[PDB]
């Protein structure tokens, strides 16, 4: 509950509404049957074991249904991912000093130094080279996102 304990009362209320779209009988639990109904409304045709698998990913207590606390943990994890994505785009905008969509070595040097980083010139060059998948000498947004993706 450490993740869910980080949510505001307002976020909890939004998420209670989201939970209700799954928990259509209002009994406090999302079942595989309920999930299947939602997935079919999304144009999917899952199997029972697929639904069970989806439940299992969220079902911290192993009881086979999703309660509100488990739902809140899931939503808190999604919020954290959204926040991380936002931090990465905002950092890209700064590192790409001229806004042209590519981080050059010179730009990276400037930003690093202005942030008080003491990286040597070789280290800056290395950072560009490692991230530069396409070989054009600079780092585009998708290259940056890949570089910042956990392992």
């Amino acid at each position: 509950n450490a993740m869910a304990d980080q949510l505001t009362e307002e976020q909890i209320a939004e998420f209670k509404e989201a939970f209700s779209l799954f928990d259509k009988d209002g009994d406090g639990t999302i079942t595989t049957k309920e999930l299947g109904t939602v997935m079919r409304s999304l144009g999917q045709n899952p199997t029972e074991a697929e639904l069970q698998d989806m439940i299992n990913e969220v079902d911290a207590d192993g009881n086979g249904t999703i309660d509100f606390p488990e739902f809140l943990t899931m939503m808190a994890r999604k919020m954290k991912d959204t926040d991380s994505e936002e931090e990465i785009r905002e950092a890209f905008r700064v590192f790409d000093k001229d806004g042209n969509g590519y981080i050059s070595a010179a730009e990276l040097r400037h930003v690093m130094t202005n942030l008080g980083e003491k990286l040597t010139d070789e280290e800056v060059d290395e950072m560009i080279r490692e991230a530069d998948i396409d070989g054009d000498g600079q780092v585009n947004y998708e290259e940056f996102v890949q570089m910042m993706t956990a392992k």
Binding site: E90, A91, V94, L115, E117, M127, E130, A131, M147, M148
Partner: peptide, 13 residues
């Protein structure tokens, strides 16, 4: 690695 350096800089931002 390069990722850690980029990350350390992002935390300064």
């Amino acid at each position: 690695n390069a990722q850690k350096k980029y990350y350390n800089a992002m935390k300064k931002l």
